[PDB]
Design a protein around this ligand. Structure first.
Ligand SMILES: OC[C@H]1O[C@@H](NC(=S)N/N=C/c2ccc(Br)cc2)[C@H](O)[C@@H](O)[C@@H]1O
Ligand SMILES: OC[C@H]1O[C@@H](NC(=S)N/N=C/c2ccc(Br)cc2)[C@H](O)[C@@H](O)[C@@H]1O
Ligand SMILES: OC[C@H]1O[C@@H](NC(=S)N/N=C/c2ccc(Br)cc2)[C@H](O)[C@@H](O)[C@@H]1O
Ligand SMILES: OC[C@H]1O[C@@H](NC(=S)N/N=C/c2ccc(Br)cc2)[C@H](O)[C@@H](O)[C@@H]1O
Lengths: 810, 810
């Protein structure tokens, strides 16, 4: 039907149809009489996956013959979403499969909805890993993603009585057609035990063993015939485990619990032993696999020439002492040589500045679980601190600030300090974030080793985040500038010469309207909720966090409601305000915020005076597949974190690429987005980082704002008095108290500017032509935010490898 | 190569080769450079399984269109062994696959060794279920096997220092190519809760729910294109289960533990809650599936015309009150009608008379776990006992003897009594066993309802137990009488006219010698143990039980050793004595017996004076795949249970079919085997049932035997003094004490006759011609012991269905 979806050739369509029937029969053991919709999905998945196989074998074979430097991306999170459409897109099979299924009497889009998200991540960090894998394959890098195959991913969110309920994400229940178990590479991982010092070095003995079994998932590049591997480890008990009899067999569950569930606590570091076990498990299995592949090329001098390990935050930081352990204890390298190898191999990416999220493991935990690693960390620390002492003689406070070991009630290891010490490169994920790292939280480290600190501004893949989710937009763009932009997103700049083109303006606006109608219909069908598709779609989707300031959004919503109620017969630009995102299960304030949003909806949506001029909807179970639907439909992207708190954001880039305008603070990548598009084409408001700093020095007094802004006072009074919870008048007392007395994120301080800026948004929307021209100016300058650009920068400036857009033979 | 293995046509071989390569590539994601032996096995399994698919779909479709009466065989055990060769045999694909793999440079027999046994049973009862499934498919019956998909089957047995060690049988670790998950038939099973009595009947409420997910395995008939289903249930937690967060997800293991492991305690009934849960789980899921299929044909009068449920022992006895529960509580049938339906639907097969194996569930367990079922059982009991009281007025002791409820310390439900009450047919498994049921343990029930009691003598499938495991024997038989005997085993009688045929005598003896050489080589290669292949292979393989009297065998072995040591330069017929079998992990005496056997081996095998004249080997990890190897190799089958204790035995029939002579007591099916072959062609010794009864009346005094048999005294003295355990002189004091003071199985009482009978065995073996002629007389009369005969009897006399040897279209 549409051009960017590929050719639907006669031969290909015929072959797809016959392979679909073959799989239905031989693979699913069904005929058309008894086949369920799920059977049809699986038949299609197997049909498509067959096309990856040759490319996958020949890609890995090529890496064996050419022996390039290998990139190992270590993450505890890979937020992949669905795989079927992505695979079809990257293989140019979409139209052919659509035609083939149509002729078989099936709707392919309906089949696509059957696939579970691989929800193996929490939010931005997990999704970044996934975009990165796609870009590495598209850029022809010999790259592997390594993580954990969680049996249960991020919980499914249900809203019951306005409250978040969690249910287990049993995503493997029907089987996963995109994975291949690799039992021949099953590896032992060691825990507990004790250290013995012999004549010939230390030995880690009396350990408990858990097996690590790998599962490989393909990562296809965009039409280049490259298929890379994501290898995820699953925990398996050894067969003699605990081996009264019945109990011993049942107790195998204990060992296998390691890979059972993704930790969803993205707000607050919890020193939980099971989490520590997960972190070591992925690291130990991965490093043995890396070393095996390196040997199948004695001389570890060449190790950093053939291996790069990227640590996605500090979660896999144990790679540093584990690499030392293998090199010193097993390979018998001297300490200094081993250390040089380690440093040159490892690089570390930081994803946050919030102190409560920093991993600081109690020493007593590491002592019991990983006694040899603790010893190694102590030795790393002593040698590192000796370097600090030599560089800054007499600066004793610097020594305690930089120590990997934190003294206090419980001694802790600061994993970020370990990562900086043991890496040749440290990067933040947006220019302002990387600057904050050099100036504030890692200032001491920057002063010691300034060459280590880099920036790598985040990006998103334009395959999933434009071609897949918004084919209508991709197509009208391709009609004018061709298809090359899909793997060279900077080419979108050519769209600037179309900002005055009446045909293009009409098409951009039409695609948005179509996306909005489609989403308005998705809401009615799957959720029985009714929305006005001519309203401005005002969207804030992201995990619920105080720093992300969904509360500020709530305050605006109530302001709009109160203004309408005050002057009911005055015209206002109709809005559909959509907020969605999951709260970490133990984060009380975040759960209260969700309840607030639904409570506002309950009042606003049923007020007859309001009509269809304002609607507040909580988007349930926000996840990658829902993002693919809502983002193309959005007019306004809410990116309103307190300046200095959102390291980068990536949702912001998704909205920019898909034709929404952004209202945002100068925080994270918003700064660079505004810089690319021009500040005139962005709705910027609020404190800058410097203003926040000024406010902290003075002391933040929320009362001052309450006293001087009558509209804000009214909202707080409504919240306190039970206007939004008639039967539980004090329901929101925690929220009011926090806002009034302990708001780390200065919600009131940005309120006035936010509301005024929102008025300017409404003003522009009244003029559809000018709204759309500004939209074109955003899309046209979104090129920098391709993860292809990000990955090319990692490759050249950190990994020491050249990307390549050249095809492998088909 | 050999005729009974089918045609290796050019077209078929070419197609097998190409489908093998297709699976290696597309299914296993490998090419020949990196493929492991296990990959080759899987490629072959997938190639063969493709051939089942059309037949499987068309068989089930046929049952839907013709709507025959369906047979549901309920068992907690299905001891299937390996599936690959069996599938090839039943599809006539063996030679073609052998040729195809040969041309690809692979040894098919080597590939076959890679397959794990499906070890979903303990011994005879589990293996009987498997033979029965094969026969039901071969006889064209619309039959389903229903059980549990245990994650862990019978433990793998390791021998360490002469002691049994158990390890988990992780048989699904690499995936099972013979199963298809059927998620659309996932069903809820209820536990705990409480009963409410409303205006309109009882209601079972506040239950905990565990999901039952079915997995289908094909059961191919012998060359008739019939493929029946074995459906095994797996336990799955519902998604809102226990839904702090992390723990709730980890706790899902609790629910799923139901299908985790097979109970291996075949010696002693343990009232363990988890076992009770397994029993209800299989019953509840199966009955819903049965009823669903029955409705997809309101009127339950026709239920017994369309449904037969066979209960394999009392393990699925809860089917009776569960059927009542569904009929009364859910369908609202009156009690008496529901009961009539239930009785006409259910039949019960008893497999033992040993009191300690009888299931007697504590009332307090059923009260908590299954409160409604207990109420139903109480009501069944009252109505049943009212019938007893009317039939035998004033016989108050009969009332307490026949009650389903046993009074005592803890009240218990006698599940065997429940099964008799609620079934239209009760059968034993060999003529003498069924007689014992009528005369002793169920005498009261027989007197009340004599029409209910039947015999169905056990059988084995001649597909697995001749064609598959002994193709050489199958072939020399087919050369003379054709191939029809394979599904009509009575035709083996035609071999009687060959007992004087010199060519046939030579061939029978040659096949045995070849089997023995092959097994002698298997022992050296996989276990590094050295045996003389010209010795008599004296084999006792079966689970270790006091009643099976492996100890009696041990006493003979020691007798032979002592006689050799006494007269070293006298000629004796060389023997290789092989004993194998697993002991239930909590059965101390059985574990002591294994240690005794190995301890005897340790002395006997290293005595220079003995030479290669006597060797004692413990066959480690006896299981179906090992039985397939050792049984064809055996000369002498040890079937030496105390008369009245082995209900049937089936190992006995396997040896008879494969050319071993039998030394045995007149117990179980041995009686009928001797009757078929003629007593002159069997080595019968020892007490008959009547002699055992006489001895019990008098009182069994082991001392008397010890005092009057000098050779027996010597052995006991050697055992006591530490001759067989020099470093732990008292190791075997438990064994001696048991033999001397509390031997329920009268080992000493059969000793003299056993030893004398064994002398007659040695005498015959000295004359190979006469040995072989007697062997021919055994094989030729083994026809009655085909499970095809057994199943045809069940079909006609219990299920009310006619078997059919007619082909379905290919
Ligand atoms: O879903 C059923 C099972 O499938 C198995 N896959 C097998 S046998 N072949 N896959 C081949 C394959 C071919 C191409 C791609 Br692109 C990916 C996999 C997986 O190993 C199991 O984990 C899984 O549960
Ligand atoms: O760079 C990608 C994105 O990274 C995000 N960091 C995230 S999701 N950390 N999660 C941390 C975490 C900690 C413990 C657990 Br258990 C789970 C998650 C930043 O907040 C975004 O600004 C940035 O765009
Ligand atoms: O082993 C990998 C997985 O395979 C799956 N089988 C699938 S997808 N098709 N089978 C088709 C089939 C075709 C013919 C026969 Br005869 C039996 C099964 C099973 O459902 C899983 O339980 C198993 O783990
Ligand atoms: O009819 C087939 C065979 O049945 C056998 N019974 C067996 S294996 N019962 N297992 C009972 C059992 C009880 C509890 C558990 Br937990 C496990 C097994 C008889 O002993 C044989 O004589 C007979 O030939």
């Amino acid at each position: 039907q549409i051009s960017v979806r590929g050719l639907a050739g006669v031969e290909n369509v015929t072959e797809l149809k016959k392979n679909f029937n073959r799989h239905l029969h031989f693979t699913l053991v069904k005929d058309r009489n008894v086949a369920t919709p799920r059977d049809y999905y699986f038949a299609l998945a197997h049909t498509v996956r067959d096309h990856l196989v040759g490319r996958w074998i020949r890609t890995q074979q090529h890496y064996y013959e050419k022996d390039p430097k290998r990139i190992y991306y270590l993450s505890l999170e890979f937020y992949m979403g669905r795989t079927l459409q992505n695979t079809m897109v990257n293989l140019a099979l979409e139209n052919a499969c659509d035609e083939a299924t149509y002729q078989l009497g099936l709707d392919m889009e309906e089949l696509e909805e059957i696939e579970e998200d691989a929800g193996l991540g929490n939010g931005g960090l997990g999704r970044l890993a996934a975009c990165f894998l796609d870009s590495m394959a598209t850029l022809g890098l010999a790259a592997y993603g390594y993580g954990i195959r969680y049996e249960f991913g991020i919980f499914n969110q249900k809203i019951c009585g306005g409250w978040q309920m969690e249910e287990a994400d049993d995503w493997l229940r029907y089987g996963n057609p995109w994975e291949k178990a690799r039992p021949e590479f099953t590896l032992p991982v060691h825990f507990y035990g004790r250290v013995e010092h012999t004549s010939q070095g230390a030995k880690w003995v009396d350990t408990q063993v858990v097996l690590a079994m790998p599962y490989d998932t393909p990562v296809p590049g965009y039409r280049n015939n490259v298929v890379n591997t994501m290898r995820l480890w699953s925990a398996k008990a050894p067969n003699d485990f605990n081996l009264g009899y019945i109990q011993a067999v049942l107790d195998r569950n204990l060992a296998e619990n390691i890979s059972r569930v993704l930790y969803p606590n993205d707000n607050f570091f919890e020193g939980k032993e099971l989490r520590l076990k997960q972190e070591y498990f992925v690291v130990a299995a991965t490093l043995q696999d890396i070393i095996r592949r390196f040997k199948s090329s004695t001389n570890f001098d060449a190790f950093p020439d053939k291996v790069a390990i990227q640590l996605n935050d500090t979660h896999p930081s144990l790679a540093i002492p584990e690499l030392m352990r293998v090199l010193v204890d097993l390979e018998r390298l001297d300490w200094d040589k081993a250390w040089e190898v380690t440093v040159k191999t490892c690089a570390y990416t930081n994803h946050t500045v919030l102190p409560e999220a920093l991993e600081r493991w109690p020493v007593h935990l590491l002592e019991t679980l990983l006694p040899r690693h603790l010893q190694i960390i102590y030795e790393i620390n002593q040698r590192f601190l000796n370097r600090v002492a030599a560089a800054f003689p007499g600066d004793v406070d610097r020594l305690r600030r930089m120590s990997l070991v934190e003294e206090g009630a419980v001694k802790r290891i600061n994993m970020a300090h370990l990562c900086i010490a043991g890496s040749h490169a440290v990067n933040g994920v947006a220019r302002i974030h990387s600057e904050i790292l050099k100036k504030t939280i890692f200032k001491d480290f920057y002063e010691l080793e300034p060459h280590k600190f880099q920036n790598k501004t985040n990006g998103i893949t334009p395959r999933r985040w434009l071609v897949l989710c918004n084919p209508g937009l991709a197509e009208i763009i391709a009609e004018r500038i061709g298809e090359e932009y899909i793997s060279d997103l900077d080419q979108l700049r050519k769209l600037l010469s179309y900002v005055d083109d009446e045909a293009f303006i009409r098409d951009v606006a039409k695609v948005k309207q179509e996306n909005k109608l489609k989403f308005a219909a998705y809401l009615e069908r799957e959720y029985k909720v009714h929305i006005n598709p001519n309203s401005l779609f005002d969207v804030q989707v992201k995990r619920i966090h105080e720093y992300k300031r969904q509360l500020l959004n709530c305050l605006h919503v109530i302001t709009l409601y109160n203004r309408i109620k005050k002057e009911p017969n005055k015209f206002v630009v109709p809005r559909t305000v959509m907020i969605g995102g999951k709260a970490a299960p133990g984060y009380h304030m975040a759960k209260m915020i969700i309840k607030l949003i639904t409570a506002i909806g309950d009042v606003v949506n049923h007020d007859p005076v309001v009509g269809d001029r304002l609607r507040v909807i909580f988007l349930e179970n926000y996840r990658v597949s829902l993002a693919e639907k809502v983002i193309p439909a959005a007019d306004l992207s809410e990116q309103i974190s307190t300046a200095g708190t959102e390291a980068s954001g990536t949702g912001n880039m998704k909205f920019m690429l898909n034709g929404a305008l952004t209202i945002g603070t100068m925080d994270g990548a918003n700064v660079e987005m505004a810089e690319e598009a021009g500040e005139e084409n962005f709705f910027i408001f609020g404190m800058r980082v410097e203003d926040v700093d000024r406010l902290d020095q003075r002391g933040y007094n929320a009362q001052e704002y309450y006293d001087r802004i009558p509209e804000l006072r009214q909202i707080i009074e409504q919240l306190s008095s039970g206007f939004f919870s008639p039967k539980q008048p004090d329901l929101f007392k925690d929220i009011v108290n926090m806002l009034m007395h302990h708001d780390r994120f200065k919600v009131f301080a940005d309120y006035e500017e936010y509301v005024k800026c929102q008025e300017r948004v409404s003003a522009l929307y009244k003029n559809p032509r000018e709204w759309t021209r500004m939209v074109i100016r955003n899309i046209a300058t979104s090129g920098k935010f391709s993860s292809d650009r990000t990955i090319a920068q990692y490759a050249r400036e950190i990994w020491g490898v050249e990307p390549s857009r050249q095809r492998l033979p088909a």
